[PDB]
Every structure is written in C-alpha cells, then in structure tokens.
Amino acid sequence: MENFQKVEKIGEGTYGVVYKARNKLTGEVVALKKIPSTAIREISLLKELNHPNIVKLLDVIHTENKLYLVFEFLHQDLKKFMDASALTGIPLPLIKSYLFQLLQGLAFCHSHRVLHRDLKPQNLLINTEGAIKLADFGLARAFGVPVRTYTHEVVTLWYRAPEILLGCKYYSTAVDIWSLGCIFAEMVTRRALFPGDSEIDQLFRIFRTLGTPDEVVWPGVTSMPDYKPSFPKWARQDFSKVVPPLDEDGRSLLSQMLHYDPNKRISAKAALAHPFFQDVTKPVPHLRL
Ligand SMILES: Cc1cnc2c(NCc3ccncc3)nccn12
Fold it and tell me: Phosphotyrosine-modified residues are where?
C-alpha cells in the first residue's frame, strides 16, 4: 500500500471502503478497495477475466493479513447518473446501449462460468465515451454475500432473483439476468421495480407484479426450501402497465429476463440477438464530473 496515495473515499462497498488513489510511481489513478486461501485463489482467477464491459482488476495486494483490490477507475456510477437524469429520464437509445453492453459483459463472464450475484446500479460504472462496466464481478463467490456491509449498511434486496429468495442453494447465471432486467425496468421508468425492504417484502413485491408462482409457470417451485403454500395468490400484471412507455420489443425482452423458471429465463447470449437490439447505437452520455 505504500505505493498508493489515497485521494478520496468514493464509497463503502460491500466488502470494504473504496478510495480513489494515485500510484505514487506510475501516477496511475485507480480505485482501491479495502477488504483464506480459497478467497485468495478465487480472486486471483478474476485477474484474467478481462472484458471491455468488466471493470479491470489490476492487482491484488495481500499484506499484514489485510486484502486490497486495485481496480481501474471510472468517474460515475449508474445510480448517480440515474439520479442526475431523473427530471428527463435517460434517453431510450442510451438505455438500449447500456443494456446491450452489460449483456455482452454477462455473456462473457457466464461463458467462463463466473457469476456476479449482486448486480445493482451502484456497481455499474460509466465513462464519458458511452461505455458501462460491471464492478465487483466474482467477489460474491470469492468472499460470499452478506446481509450487512462492514459499514452495517443494509445490502439491497431489490435486484435479487426469486430462486435465491426461495432458498435455492445452487442458483445459476440466470440470477444475473434477473438483476439486469430489474435495472433495465428502473432505467426506463425512473423508479426501482421491486424495492423490497425485507426478504418477504421483496418476494411479495415480485409476486404482486408477476403473479404468485405456481407449478404451472415454474415446475418444482412448490418444493423449494423457503416456499410456503400459505403465500397469497396474486394475479400477474401486464408489462404495458409495469414499464410504460417501453415498446413491444423492449417489453418482450424484459419478460424473458424476468421469467420465473431460471431454466427458461433468457441467457445473455440469446438476449443479445433479441429484436430490441436491431437498431442499437452507442450514444455518449452527458456527464458532469
Ligand atoms: C471499483 C471502482 C472504480 N471506479 C469506481 C467508482 N467510481 C465512481 C465515483 C468516482 C468519484 N467519486 C465518487 C464515485 N465508484 C465505485 C467503485 N469504483
């Protein structure tokens, strides 16, 4: 760490505080994240998982039994950008470009059997060139996913897939497609899709919009560990009501990204081929740094 000069704190991640820092030598500006052999090995694997839509893991510093992860620095996150674009909303072509890029990032990670597991606007980082990138990829498998960050800040449930909430132990890459569908809806409507404030409130918000899942739409759901026959039975709502005024192509894709059955939920690779992206472009966001 003597090689870095902390410039400022840019947030408190799930596994520790993140600082903007400068390499005392190269002068390179980076994000320094202050955090077992298994964890060390897993994190080490992440260094090779490189893609233009995945925030680059530059190095890992393991000292005094303390862990620091050195990342590429980006100037803004999607949560801030959305708050800033609240009055007018993010233009559709930009939402479309961001979604397309994030799907490319996911398709890449998923091909290497690596899941993110905790996608949320705070871990989607953007630059002036119109790129968006996934931050903290793989850290959940490496260290695990807690309920409260080292800062005691409640870990958001808003983007959690229903199979996780229902106790599935061996969930899949489909969990990241669910999260991204939630974020896609939020960019379009300017409001979180399922802002649950407890595990049961999160599940019930999902059920109220998508209908209470049953064996018809999700074979095996009633056997899941945390499924209860006493759950209320709510009817499904039309997506025309959920994400107006998204067009039919967007509503169709969002529907496949929010399918209950993880086996049937669209993959990142298949989503890239969806008609919604026929006219995709790469606009530049107007960032105020
Ligand atoms: C791993 C990582 C790389 N860049 C960021 C990042 N950048 C946004 C920002 C920049 C400056 N001040 C506040 C937030 N936020 C969180 C994590 N980050």
Answer: 15, 19
